[PDB]
Amino acid sequence: TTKGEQAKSQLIAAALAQFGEYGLHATTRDIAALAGQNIAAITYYFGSKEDLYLACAQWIADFLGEKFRPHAEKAERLFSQPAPDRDAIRELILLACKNMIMLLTQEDTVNLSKFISREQLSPTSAYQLVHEQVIDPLHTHLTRLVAAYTGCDANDTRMILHTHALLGEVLAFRLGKETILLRTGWPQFDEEKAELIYQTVTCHIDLILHGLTQ
Amino acid sequence: MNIPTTTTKGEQAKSQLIAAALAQFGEYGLHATTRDIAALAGQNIAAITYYFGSKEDLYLACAQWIADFLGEKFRPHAEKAERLFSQPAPDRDAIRELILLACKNMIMLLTQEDTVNLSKFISREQLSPTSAYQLVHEQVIDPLHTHLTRLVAAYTGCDANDTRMILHTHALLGEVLAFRLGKETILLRTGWPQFDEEKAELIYQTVTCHIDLILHGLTQ
Numbered sequence: 564t565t566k567g568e569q570a571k572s573q574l575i576a577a578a579l580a581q582f583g584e585y586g587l588h589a590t591t592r593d594i595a596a597l598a599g600q601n602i603a604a605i606t607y608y609f610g611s612k613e614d615l616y617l618a619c620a621q622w623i624a625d626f627l628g629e630k631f632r633p634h635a636e637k638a639e640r641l642f643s644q645p646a647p648d649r650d651a652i653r654e655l656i657l658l659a660c661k662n663m664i665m666l667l668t669q670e671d672t673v674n675l676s677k678f679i680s681r682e683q684l685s686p687t688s689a690y691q692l693v694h695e696q697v698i699d700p701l702h703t704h705l706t707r708l709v710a711a712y713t714g715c716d717a718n719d720t721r722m723i724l725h726t727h728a729l730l731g732e733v734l735a736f737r738l739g740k741e742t743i744l745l746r747t748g749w750p751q752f753d754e755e756k757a758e759l760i761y762q763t764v765t766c767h768i769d770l771i772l773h774g775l776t777q
Numbered sequence: 778m779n780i781p782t783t784t785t786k787g788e789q790a791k792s793q794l795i796a797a798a799l800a801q802f803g804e805y806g807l808h809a810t811t812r813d814i815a816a817l818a819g820q821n822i823a824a825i826t827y828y829f830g831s832k833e834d835l836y837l838a839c840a841q842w843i844a845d846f847l848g849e850k851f852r853p854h855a856e857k858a859e860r861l862f863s864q865p866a867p868d869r870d871a872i873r874e875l876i877l878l879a880c881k882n883m884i885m886l887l888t889q890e891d892t893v894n895l896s897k898f899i900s901r902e903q904l905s906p907t908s909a910y911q912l913v914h915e916q917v918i919d920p921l922h923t924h925l926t927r928l929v930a931a932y933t934g935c936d937a938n939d940t941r942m943i944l945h946t947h948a949l950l951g952e953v954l955a956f957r958l959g960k961e962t963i964l965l966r967t968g969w970p971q972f973d974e975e976k977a978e979l980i981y982q983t984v985t986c987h988i989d990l991i992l993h994g995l996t997q
Contacts, residue, residue: 586804588806681897683962684896684960694961699962702962702966720967724979724980727956728983729952729987731958732948732952735954736948737904739951741903742903742922743947745919746943759940759944760944763941766994767991770993771987773990
């Protein structure tokens with residue numbers, strides 16, 4: 564029901580806020596209160612606090628998966644033709660970064676980042692869920708695009724490292740959000756600022772992709 | 778950091794309470810309890826009241842400890858950078874060396890378990906800033922970030938005060954931080970059980986490679 568799904572949405576949003584900030588020390592009482600609902604709603608729709616925590620991870624995997632589906636379908640169509648189109652590959656890489664950058668400059672997704680950041684340094688079954696469902700495939704596909712562009716071996720530890728280092732440039736603005744806002748004097752991000760970030764990262768990626776081409 | 782300790786016993790216990798606090802605050806923020814922090818530090822809960830006064834002051838003390846820790850680790854780089862900028866036309870190669878030196882030190886620091894809690898603490902603050910972040914930002918991150926931006930500007934021949942130069946520098950610093958901030962995903966992707974000196978060598982080689990490509994591309 565649109566009413567029940569909306570109830571679950573509010574609870575997930577509130578849980579992300581609470582869990583993102585305090586991890587499992589967050590209470591279902593506070594999450595329910597923040598979501599504007601009875602605590603019974605959590606037990607009914609999700610179960611225990613731990614069940615809700617994992618449901619937040621599932622939501623993040625679903626969210627991220629949807630955001631990047633378009634790019635995956637587009638890559639499939641590219642590697643659907645026999646015709647070699649090397650700059651089309653570079654186009655996919657840059658386009659993924661753009662989408663990542665857009666996503667990572669909205670206050671809309673800050674609690675999703677708080678939740679993932681914590682799990683990154685203290686893995687739970689929650690991280691594993693998101694990793695298997697979305698992060699491993701996306702990171703792998705990205706490594707493969709880089710490998711294919713530069714003509715290297717995608718499974719080589721070195722390709723994996725180059726790609727991970729490369730991705731760090733994109734994530735740098737969300738992960739080091741407060742320091743870059745203070746250093747640039749921007750009170751917060753917006754369309755035009757995210758545009759500059761994109762231009763910066765794109766510059767570096769192009770520089771890196773060409774220097775690596777074997 | 779609060780009121781100075783006069784004995785070794787006091788300095789010891791106070792240090793263990795901060796270690797425990799970094800762990801608890803890093804993981805749970807201010808929802809961490811003083812009972813848990815004390816229990817973990819092997820101290821009494823009254824010790825927290827005595828040395829820090831409150832949970833909130835202990836939180837700030839952790840921010841202070843992190844500032845001092847990092848400020849020290851990069852004090853030599855700051856001294857070199859200054860000493861380098863005090864020349865009519867600094868040495869372009871020594872500039873690059875210094876940038877790489879900062880990266881190498883960030884990497885060897887970001888590949889050791891004993892600093893993970895420091896990262897947890899900063900990461901939370903980075904997305905949900907309090908006075909704690911401001912403190913670390915003023916004493917260390919602002920100074921070091923500005924130095925690197927200056928170094929990168931000097932090398933490429935650009936304006937260190939131009940917003941685009943601040944963005945370029947931050948973007949390439951992400952290359953280094955990716956390995957700690959995206960720890961679980963890179964360990965899983967590479968198959969590495971954890972980081973060690975040899976893996977740090979590979980990470981540095983990767984980053985050194987990218988930074989060079991970028992520095993040369995930005996010069997022209």
